[PDB]
Write a protein that binds this ligand. Structure first.
Ligand SMILES: [Sr+2]
Lengths: 43, 43, 43, 43
C-alpha cells in the first residue's frame, strides 16, 4: 500500500502547486478590480 | 507507512490555508464587482 | 493507521465541499463580469 | 486499509476536476477584467 500512498503524496503536492498558482492569480484580480473601481470614482 | 501518512496530513493543512485565502479573496472580488456594476447602472 | 486514514478521507471531503462552493461563486463572477462589460459597450 | 486508500484516490480525482474548472474560469475572468479596464482607459 506504500506504493499507493506514495502516489497520493505526489499528486497532492502537484495539485497544491496548482492551487498556489491560482492564489497568485486571484491576488491580481483583486488589484485589477480596485483599479477599475477607481476609474469610476470622481477624484 | 506512518511517515507517509504524516506527509499527507501536513499537505492537507497547507491546502486548507490556501482554500481559506481563495475563499476570502473571492468575497472581496464579488463585493467589488457588485459595486462596479452599480457605478455603471441607473440607481 | 486506519484511524488516521479515516480522518484524511473526512477532511478531504470537507475541503472539497469548500472548493465546490468556491466553484459556484466563480461562475457568478464570470456572469457579473460579462454584465459589466456590456454596460461599457455600445448597443 | 486498501478500501480507505481507494476512497482517497477518488476524492483526489474529483478535486482535480474542480481545480481544472477554477483554473479555466480564472483565466476567463482576468481576460474580462483587462478588457473592462481598457474600455475605461485612454488608449
Ligand atoms: Sr475570481
Amino acid at each position: 500500500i506504500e506504493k499507493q500512498m506514495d502516489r497520493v503524496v505526489k499528486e497532492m503536492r502537484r495539485q497544491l502547486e496548482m492551487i498556489d498558482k491560482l492564489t497568485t492569480r486571484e491576488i491580481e484580480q483583486v488589484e485589477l478590480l480596485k483599479r477599475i473601481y477607481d476609474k469610476l470614482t470622481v477624484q
